[PDB]
Design an enzyme around this catalytic site. Structure first.
Site, PDB file in Angstrom:
ATOM      1  CB  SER A  26      -1.015  -0.098   1.124  1.00  0.00           C
ATOM      2  OG  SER A  26      -1.667  -1.331   1.057  1.00  0.00           O
ATOM      3  CG  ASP A  31      -5.463  -1.568  -4.787  1.00  0.00           C
ATOM      4  OD1 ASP A  31      -5.829  -0.556  -4.171  1.00  0.00           O
ATOM      5  OD2 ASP A  31      -4.716  -2.440  -4.302  1.00  0.00           O
ATOM      6  CG  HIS A  77      -5.707  -2.508  -0.341  1.00  0.00           C
ATOM      7  ND1 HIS A  77      -4.983  -1.836  -1.304  1.00  0.00           N
ATOM      8  CD2 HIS A  77      -5.402  -1.921   0.840  1.00  0.00           C
ATOM      9  CE1 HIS A  77      -4.280  -0.876  -0.728  1.00  0.00           C
ATOM     10  NE2 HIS A  77      -4.519  -0.904   0.572  1.00  0.00           N
TER      11      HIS A  77
HETATM   12  C1  LIG Z   1      -5.075   5.094  -3.586  1.00  0.00           C
HETATM   13  C2  LIG Z   1      -4.189   6.179  -4.195  1.00  0.00           C
HETATM   14  O1  LIG Z   1      -4.467   6.668  -5.240  1.00  0.00           O
HETATM   15  N1  LIG Z   1      -2.998   6.644  -3.521  1.00  0.00           N
HETATM   16  C3  LIG Z   1      -2.126   7.667  -4.086  1.00  0.00           C
HETATM   17  C4  LIG Z   1      -0.809   7.414  -3.422  1.00  0.00           C
HETATM   18  C5  LIG Z   1       0.087   8.582  -3.842  1.00  0.00           C
HETATM   19  C6  LIG Z   1       0.586   7.718  -4.993  1.00  0.00           C
HETATM   20  C7  LIG Z   1       0.223   6.528  -4.119  1.00  0.00           C
HETATM   21  C8  LIG Z   1      -1.180   6.620  -2.164  1.00  0.00           C
HETATM   22  C9  LIG Z   1      -0.417   6.323  -1.056  1.00  0.00           C
HETATM   23  F1  LIG Z   1       0.832   6.824  -1.116  1.00  0.00           F
HETATM   24  C10 LIG Z   1      -0.915   5.577   0.024  1.00  0.00           C
HETATM   25  C11 LIG Z   1      -2.234   5.108  -0.012  1.00  0.00           C
HETATM   26  C12 LIG Z   1      -3.018   5.400  -1.130  1.00  0.00           C
HETATM   27  C13 LIG Z   1      -2.428   6.183  -2.212  1.00  0.00           C
END
Ligand SMILES: CC(=O)N1CC2(CCC2)c2c(F)cccc21
Ligand SMILES: *[C@@H]1O[C@H](CO)[C@@H](O)[C@H](O)[C@H]1NC(C)=O
Length: 360
Positions: free
Chosen positions: A145, A253, A302
């Site tokens: 994650s 996801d 997930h």
């Molecule tokens: C679900 C989602 O689009 N993102 C964006 C991001 C920034 C790029 C990854 C992120 C995290 F860094 C942690 C949990 C969710 C999400």
């Protein structure tokens, strides 16, 4: 069990200034080291970080951490549960910086919280070198994650750190689980006015400034000042990376769907949402076409790698522990017969793969 060690450098802290740390189970005689980055979303302003501090405090503070944790999935030491790396040295790095592992900012008169994710990783590596990591042949930086995105942001910095410290023989590799997101159109759109309405691109843009977030150098040089948020998206940062990275990503996801404002309940999915979901899986599959080491099942789920039943899912008849083993073979000093490393489902709807997690 993995045993807690709080960082000896107490300037490297969780959000509230308490010391960061790591959980360690050594395996004497193994020169493999698995450093796993925990996930758990992030926070990007004072208000939403304060809320997270009320009800998700273990993700912002070490004050209540237990002295041990049980290794599960890829962190298990039992070959029955972990066919891949059961004999490795195991490290679980708790996520207590709320910054997708990108921050380099201390708590101060100007900062209510410290965002030190990038420095926590560096300090864990440094302190482990005196505990046996100096003898390693492979350091696999893994994460799920937010921790999977953290792998993408930090794997090359770990490699540079070890090189500059005089350990060029340690092979640094990345395993990014469930951290490969798309900056796609949302199914329903909301203007970024509060936390819940703010899309990840804008939330990350604000987070980077709030955290003093850092991204890999080659990616930073491509996108330049004010556009570093681009480097949090796997398909954009991955081609800039030099360390080998294996990408694990469900095609549908749940965190991607959440940020896309898709909420599946039980009623029949109508045409617009059906096309939206199918297009999401197709776009994800497209971004993985040129990722030679990847595992992308057509499931609505997930995370994978620290789940105790992580061995169950298969793509084209190959499980993830097998694919990771094949990846290990492929990195020995041409494809391998019956030992594939690129495993992306082509079927277009969640659970078209019969081995998808049941949700039970
Ligand atoms: C679900 C989602 O689009 N993102 C964006 C991001 C920034 C790029 C990854 C992120 C995290 F860094 C942690 C949990 C969710 C999400
Ligand atoms: C502690 O960590 C900080 C931040 O990474 C670093 O500047 C400092 O040199 C470290 N102190 C020691 C004694 O290693």
């Amino acid at each position: 069990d993995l045993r807690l060690h709080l960082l000896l450098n107490t300037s490297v802290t969780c959000n509230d200034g308490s010391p960061a740390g790591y959980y360690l189970k050594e395996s004497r005689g193994s020169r493999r080291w698995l450093l796993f980055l925990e996930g758990g979303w992030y926070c990007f302003n004072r208000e939403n970080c304060d809320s997270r501090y009320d009800t998700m405090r273990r993700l912002m503070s070490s004050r209540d951490w237990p002295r041990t944790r049980t290794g599960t999935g890829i962190l298990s030491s039992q070959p029955e549960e972990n066919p891949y790396w059961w004999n490795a040295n195991m490290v679980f790095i708790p996520y207590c910086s709320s910054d997708v592992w990108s921050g380099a900012s201390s708590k101060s008169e100007k900062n209510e919280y410290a965002f030190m994710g990038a420095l926590i990783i560096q300090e864990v590596v440094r302190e482990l070198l005196g505990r046996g990591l100096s003898g390693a042949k492979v350091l696999l930086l893994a994460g799920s994650s937010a921790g999977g995105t953290g792998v993408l942001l930090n794997v090359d910095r770990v490699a540079e750190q070890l090189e500059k410290l005089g350990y060029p023989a340690i092979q640094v590799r990345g395993l990014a689980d469930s951290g490969w997101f798309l900056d796609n159109k949302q199914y329903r759109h909301t203007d970024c006015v509060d936390t819940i309405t703010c899309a990840p691109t804008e939330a990350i843009r604000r987070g980077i400034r709030y955290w003093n977030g850092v991204v890999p150098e080659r990616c930073r040089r491509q996108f330049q000042e004010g556009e570093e948020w681009n480097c949090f998206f796997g398909y954009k940062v991955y081609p800039t990376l030099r360390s080998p990275v294996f990408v694990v990503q469900w095609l549908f996801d749940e965190a991607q769907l959440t940020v896309d404002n898709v909420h599946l309940t039980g009623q029949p999915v109508q045409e617009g949402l059906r096309l939206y979901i199918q297009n999401l899986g197709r776009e994800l599959r497209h971004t993985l076409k040129d990722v030679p080491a990847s595992f992308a099942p057509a499931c609505l789920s997930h995370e994978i790698i620290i789940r105790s039943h992580w061995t169950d899912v298969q793509v084209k008849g190959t499980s993830l522990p097998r694919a990771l083993h094949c990846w290990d073979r492929s990195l020995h000093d041409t494809p391998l017969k019956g030992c594939p490393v690129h495993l992306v489902d082509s079927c277009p709807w969640p659970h078209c793969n019969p081995s998808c997690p049941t949700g039970t």
